[PDB]
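User: Assemble these into one structure.

Assistant: Restating your components, then the assembled model:
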Amino acid sequence: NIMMTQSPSSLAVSAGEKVTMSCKSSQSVLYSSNQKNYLAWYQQKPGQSPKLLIYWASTRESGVPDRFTGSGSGTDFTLTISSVQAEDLAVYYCHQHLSSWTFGGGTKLEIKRADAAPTVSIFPPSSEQLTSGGASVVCFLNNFYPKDINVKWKIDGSERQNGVLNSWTDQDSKDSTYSMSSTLTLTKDEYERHNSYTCEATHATSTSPIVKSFNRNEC
Amino acid sequence: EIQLQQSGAELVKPGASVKISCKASGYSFTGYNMNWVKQSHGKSLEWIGKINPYYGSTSYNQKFKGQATLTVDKSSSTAYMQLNSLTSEDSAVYYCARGRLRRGGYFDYWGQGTTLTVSSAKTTPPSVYPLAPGCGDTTGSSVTLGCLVKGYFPESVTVTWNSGSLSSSVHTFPALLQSGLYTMSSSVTVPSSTWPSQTVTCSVAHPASSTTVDKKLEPS
């Protein structure tokens, strides 16, 4: 058939940088009879369906910002974003429609920005959950950068990473930050035999964490 | 404005069939091909097949030819994709997409997607826990509250915050699967001058289990 290969698989740049991503087809997608390249580009933002950006290799779809330019011919194609904006984080796919319909594997565009400390919030298990024999301790780390933050749980001053469920949001399309939730799963018995519970957040870069704590014995 | 409105998320068992709909509006339904596309979690897009609504003529990716059936109803301008003999590898998001036949057939408008889960795991309602700060805590100019939504299946769920006339910042944390059950959480941040004075409620709808739970956040 016709296979589409995209590169790079992912890249990160700061707002204001130019990016060129590539798409190669295993056969020519230039239709002999009208000399059009049957090559399209799609943008797929978090939680959304793909959206058409470019068709016939180089024609911008109505409504699409001028910073997106498609180029190339035959087997060799590129999509350029002249100056990346925060809202451009997405997976970008190329597509051919000359011989059946196939898609590339995608290029994931992430945004770089200045480091940002998380706003950290810790929550004791609710009495509702406790009466039921479970104890989930939740910590939110909101609006931080970069993505790869470390979360550590300390119980009575000593670490436990056993039983921790971590979930990151997709990057924010406006301020380029991430947020994550960290849930410490304990049995009620485990919870009731310790008192101090601490969630610590540290950039891999430093040794200055943000900590939030509570005591079970208090309230 | 063109809209392609797909049916809601489905959970079906291995070996069973499913029929997903795509209702078209804002253009000549009969004028344009309707395509279907699979996206597995991981994210490669694969074309499944297409139908020409005027004739009812179809064309399929040979990888899907045997299990997929495309039809239309031109009384409701709706396209359908039926998939039969389902397996877990068929769990994916499915899209309908309009094709531009006379420009070579690229896709120009997409539906919102329909999530298909193929599994023998049982439909299970969520437990909902409100997350309020402890009595030992303090807050600055803002306060963050949360909702933990635990132990439900299948994935389709909506967590809605009502903070009344307050403006808020919400974060929704993607669900994680454990033992065939999902757990997710959501946070809401409002000014500290406004909570607990004003009511903040987490509303959780899980259609599959006919569950709608509302939990008001109360000071500890």
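Chain A touches chain B through 51 residues (CB under 8 Å).
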